[PDB]
Chain A
Amino acid sequence: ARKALIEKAKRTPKFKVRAYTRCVRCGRARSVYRFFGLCRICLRELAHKGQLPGVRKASW
């Protein structure tokens, strides 16, 4: 998250390739889960707050 490289929202990559997920909450670009748009860190933070519906703590 260098608020300038958060130009991912650009949508004008010239070539669809250069497009890269990047976290919506931290800007974290290295563990962004498609399904949540979040990074592994925040995905864990919010899940603890119960702010991610359905998402519980698995155990078996």
Chain B
Amino acid sequence: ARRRRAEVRQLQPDLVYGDVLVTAFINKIMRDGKKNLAARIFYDACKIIQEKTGQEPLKVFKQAVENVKPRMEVRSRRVGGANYQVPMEVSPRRQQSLALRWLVQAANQRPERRAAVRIAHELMDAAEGKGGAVKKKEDVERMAEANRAYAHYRW
């Protein structure tokens, strides 16, 4: 991207919750372009959340995402021989990209045999404030500021 500024491409709203944020999560889940299988997995998850929870899955989904979004992160920058971990804000766009990516990654780290259970349970532990996803988010933010000494290298 040396010329333009590659504009964010819009996604087709969910075929159920009619949410773009959902298609997104589905895309991350998807592997080898098997968007059907991807779709099913996510849905059985919204279902499993309906089960163990008397709350609309869509609301749980959101909440979860929100808790995994990193509002700060460290970025490497070479200055004077060595490389310094410079902490800096995180654009909204990237927070979303990061939150969803981590949810799926954290979810697939889980122990439950069935894919749907994993996303479901990860999504829950997420909106709760726990789970491997939220840790990554926290281990990152802890990383930032832990290097606030270099915050003047704004970047």
- Complex: A in contact with B (CB within 8 Å): no
